Amino acid sequence: ACQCPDAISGWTHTDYQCHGLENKMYRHVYAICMNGTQVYCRTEWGSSC
């Protein structure tokens, strides 16, 4: 769920955090746009906590 005005030039993500209610780790995946912006694309879910 993300789109850049022209194109995606790169790919990054925040670090995993524990979700206190879900008891599961999540992080945010961001695409880097050609224009310099970042767009939040998905939430990645990891191991338990």
From TrEMBL:
Superkingdom, natural source: Bacteria
Organism from which the protein derives: Brevibacillus laterosporus GI-9
Matching InterPro entries: Laterosporulin
Pfam families: Laterosporulin
Name under which the protein is recorded: Putative bacteriocin
Signal peptide: none
Cystine connections: 2-41, 4-33, 18-49
